Design a protein around this ligand. Structure first.
Ligand SMILES: [Zn+2]
Lengths: 31, 48, 347, 58, 49, 159, 66, 126
RNA sequence: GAUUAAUAGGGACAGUCG
RNA sequence: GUUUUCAUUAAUCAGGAACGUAAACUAUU
């Protein structure tokens, strides 16, 4: 697998789609 | 946390897809153990 | 072809990001420096290649140009502005001893042969010339209505006070330092990455250009190229004449170093390596026997020209056998079997 | 395969090139002084700083 | 060893720069029997002769 | 209109009045114009360039005839670069100032080239079919545009 | 008008279709051109250049050729 | 059709950085693209670009960057969230930058921590 | 009082093409 | 192709609508 790919959402081309749960999951981790 | 030159050699021998992992390895604050052998095979270098 | 073994070594652990500028000391013989892409410069000693002699986190951005002064000190450009350090001092000093920010974004440096003068190529379409120890802002020489950035700058080492420059108008421009004005400007077809002069013939120059090509020009008559070296695949990033003035190194934007004779027009040698990621700056040592390659893998590599010719002291019946073989290949090198074996190289 | 397919670059005539080689280089066929003078290289590089030329020689 | 291949040199220079026999010609080319437009030109030349 | 004259406004208006009679045999926008506006601020060092402001339908009324009008305005008046422009009071206005600056020649493209830091240089190219008689007027074009607007542009023929 | 030329093409297609009655390619192109007419007409309604109670089914075609 | 003209531009930049070309022709221009490339040029991952007009952008690139990306839903982010967002988007905290459309403009996360302002995450490069 | 005229549209005309 | 016009009209398909003896070796490149 590619190393450079980030861990939050899926990547298609240059567009990175983040589901609404994942941005909530980061806000849960901060709190 | 040390990295042998065989390990740096295999990370460089892998292509430019692994340039980020190469830069991470090439962080300056770590010890670089130079190796005195031929093949640059990381498994046999580490085991010896 | 059996004893062609050109790779000799690698200077230290290398850099972290790629080597985007490097410069030798033209007075000494073992003083190299190289500035990387994360803005750290290192001064290397070629006799002890195990570790660097002096390193500093110089700038913020990449180090675009770098040079040595004639005394002992070194200069470095960036988009920050140029700085001066003393890398050979009895305490190590990380801090610079002079800095210069006014004059737009600088791109390259070139030091004079004799005096303490140097010219920095900026991005405002001008070069500007400082004399150390009695000049502060320098004198800005420019083509009168010029906007595009001057990429490279090179003092002519033979004829002092003649400065060549390339610019992203696909043009080369000259400069006479004695009467401070530009001299002549020619527009080529493609952009030129780097100008360089011949250290034995004062009038000949070479431009490494995005046409995958090296053009050897005469500075008196810019009508036609004296020679056109065409062997590359991607753009040529750096060209450097040998200090004997009869050979050339070119590091290209693909993974190749190409060694050339001066009248050849085609490759004498090609050097490549799976670990070498791109090639940005290639330059000879002042022996004219070994070449150095600053890559995008963060590595400065030391190759040799004349890949099958070993150095050191030879016995007479050893160097006579080598000279006899070279003369015999000069005669019978064009026959078919000899030709195919001497041209075969693994790319 | 031992004949030459075309003329080499500086030469202009078949008689010129095929008569210009004409003499073996080796030490079996020529004297020692001739062998040394005929296999001296054109550029003789000694060790040291090869600095660019300061002043005109001629 | 080192002399000219004269045929190959003539072909190299070509690729760089780029009433008594014309009866036995037809005698040799009436036997094929390919018609071969150079022979049509040769027939018109023989008719003119 | 808008003006009570300065020292040279009456001179340039007298030139526009004197081009009616005692001359050609050409007048179309010469009689329907009055004292309009003019400005005299330096270009380079030593030389100056006269600009005259024009009402906004009289710009096409002046596009009717500008050959040899500006020649006689250069020769007969003060031997300096004569230049007509519309008067106005944003980016469309500056675009209009450029395209009414370059009167015979149509501009083609604008290349806003940045540098390796935040600095940027605009450079507007011209038409290739007219090159010979404009290149000594290009620095006057650039300087009048800087003096009127404030944005440094440089004019260049494409090569 | 774009809508005028589109409804003119629609009346021409429907008249040829009434004379011939057997083919299906003209019927398919009629479906395409009536969808195009309704889309452009809806955009011109939501701008408001024409009456919002103006409608074309076939009687407007008949009363605009008549 | 991708209305995200920023994503079309960044796809072209990624294709050139993979193919080893030395310039592109970003055919639909914008202003957010120009600000994005302004940040990339501040941090030295792109040499020099010009906006020519019919317009399009010619982007001289150094061959230093690895990947460009846009965050497509453009989530809002505070500073205490910004630290975790940086260390979850980038492979390392010292490599690459996250682009923010703040109330002070468009800038990187280090300039956002300098100027003490939060905002929406728009893109990233490394 | 009415922007670029889009390297997305729909239409018009001309010679055509199947 | 034009020396042609309105200037977002558009993209995608839930619902729906028109046309209708066989199988068997396989943003660029
Ligand atoms: Zn080892």
């Amino acid at each position: 697998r590619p190393v450079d790919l980030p861990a939050v959402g899926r990547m298609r081309g240059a567009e990175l789609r983040i589901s609404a749960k994942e941005a909530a999951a980061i806000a849960r981790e901060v709190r | 946390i040390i990295i042998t030159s065989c390990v740096m050699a295999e990370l460089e021998k892998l292509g430019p897809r692994y340039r980020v992992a190469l830069m991470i390895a090439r962080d300056e604050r770590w010890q670089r153990l130079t190796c005195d052998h031929k093949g640059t095979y990381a498994d046999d270098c580490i085991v010896d | 072809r059996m004893f062609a073994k050109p790779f000799l070594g690698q200077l230290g652990n290398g850099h972290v990001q790629g080597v985007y500028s490097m410069c030798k000391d033209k007075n000494s013989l073992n003083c190299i420096a190289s500035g990387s892409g994360d803005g750290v410069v290192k001064v290397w000693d070629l006799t002890t290649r195990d570790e660097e002699t002096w390193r500093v986190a110089a700038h913020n951005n990449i180090v675009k140009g770098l040079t040595f002064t004639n005394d002992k000190k070194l200069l470095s450009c960036a988009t920050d502005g140029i700085k001066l350090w003393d890398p050979y001092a009895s305490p190590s000093n990380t801090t610079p001893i002079a800095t210069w920010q006014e004059g737009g974004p600088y791109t390259s440096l070139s030091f004079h042969r004799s005096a303490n003068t140097f010219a920095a190529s900026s991005g405002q379409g001008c070069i500007r010339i400082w004399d150390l120890e009695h000049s502060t802002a320098g004198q800005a020489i420019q083509w009168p209505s010029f906007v595009d950035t001057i990429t490279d700058v090179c003092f002519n080492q033979v004829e002092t006070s003649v400065i060549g420059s390339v610019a992203t108008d696909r043009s080369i421009i000259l400069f006479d330092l004695r009467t401070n004005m530009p001299v002549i400007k020619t527009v080529l077809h493609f952009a030129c990455n780097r100008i360089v002069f011949n250290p034995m013939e004062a009038m000949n120059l070479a431009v490494a250009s995005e046409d995958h090509n090296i053009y050897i020009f005469d500075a008196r008559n810019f009508d036609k190229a004296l020679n056109i070296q065409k062997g590359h695949v991607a753009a040529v990033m750096d060209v450097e004449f040998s200090p004997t003035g009869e050979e050339l190194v070119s590091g290209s934007y693909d993974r190749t170093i190409r060694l050339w004779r001066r009248d050849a027009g085609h490759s004498r040698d090609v050097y490549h390596t799976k670990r070498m990621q791109r090639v940005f700056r290639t330059m000879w040592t002042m022996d004219s026997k070994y070449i150095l390659t600053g890559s995008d893998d963060g590595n400065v590599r030391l190759w040799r020209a004349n890949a099958s010719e070993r150095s050191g002291v030879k016995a007479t019946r050893q160097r006579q056998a080598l000279e006899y073989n070279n003369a015999l290949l000069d005669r019978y090198g064009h026959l078919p079997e000899i030709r195919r074996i001497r041209r075969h190289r693994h790319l | 395969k031992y004949l030459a397919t075309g003329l080499p670059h500086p030469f202009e005539s078949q008689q010129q090139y095929e008569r210009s080689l004409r003499l073996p280089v080796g030490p079996e066929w020529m004297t020692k002084e001739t062998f040394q003078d005929a296999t001296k290289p054109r550029v003789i590089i000694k060790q040291g700083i090869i600095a660019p030329m300061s002043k005109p020689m001629y | 060893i080192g002399n000219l291949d004269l045929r190959s040199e003539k072909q190299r220079q070509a690729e760089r720069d780029l009433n008594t026999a014309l009866k036995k010609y037809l005698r040799k080319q009436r036997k094929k029997n390919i018609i071969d437009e150079k022979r049509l030109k040769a027939e018109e030349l023989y008719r003119q002769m | 209109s808008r003006q009570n004259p300065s020292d040279l406004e009456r001179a340039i208006a007298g030139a526009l009045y004197d081009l009616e009679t005692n001359t050609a045999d050409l007048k179309a926008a010469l009689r329907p114009l009055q004292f309009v506006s003019a400005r005299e601020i330096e270009v380079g060092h030593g030389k100056k360039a006269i600009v005259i402001f024009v009402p906004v339908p009289a710009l096409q009324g002046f596009h009717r005839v500008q050959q040899r009008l500006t020649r006689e305005l250069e020769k007969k008046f003060s031997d300096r670069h004569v230049l007509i422009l519309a008067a106005r009071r944003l980016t469309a206005v500056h675009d209009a100032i450029l395209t009414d600056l370059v009167y015979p020649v149509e501009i083609v493209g604008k290349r806003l080239r940045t540098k390796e830091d935040g600095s940027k240089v605009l450079k507007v190219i011209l038409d290739e079919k007219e090159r010979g008689g404009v290149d000594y007027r290009l620095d006057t074009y650039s300087e009048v545009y800087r003096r009127l607007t404030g944005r440094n542009v440089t004019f260049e023929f494409p090569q | 008008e774009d809508l005028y030329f589109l409804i003119k093409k629609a009346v021409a297609v429907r008249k040829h279709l009434e004379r011939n009655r057997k083919d299906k390619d003209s019927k398919f192109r009629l479906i395409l051109i009536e969808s195009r007419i309704h889309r452009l007409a809806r955009y011109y309604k939501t701008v408001g250049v024409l009456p919002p109670t103006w409608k074309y089914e076939s009687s407007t075609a008949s009363t605009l050729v008549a | 059709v991708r209305t995200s003209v920023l994503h079309d531009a960044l796809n072209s930049i990624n294709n050139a950085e993979k193919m080893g070309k030395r310039q592109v022709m970003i055919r639909p221009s914008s202003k957010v693209i120009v600000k994005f490339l302004q940040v990339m040029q501040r941090h030295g991952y792109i040499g020099e670009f010009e906006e020519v007009d019919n317009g399009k952008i010619v982007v001289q690139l150094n061959g230093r960057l690895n990947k460009c990306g846009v965050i497509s839903p453009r989530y809002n982010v505070r500073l205490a969230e910004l630290e975790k967002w940086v260390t979850k988007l980038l492979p390392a905290r010292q490599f690459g930058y996250v682009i923010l459309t703040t109330s002070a403009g468009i800038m990187d996360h280090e300039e956002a921590r300098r100027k003490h302002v939060a905002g929406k995450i728009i893109g990233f490069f490394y």
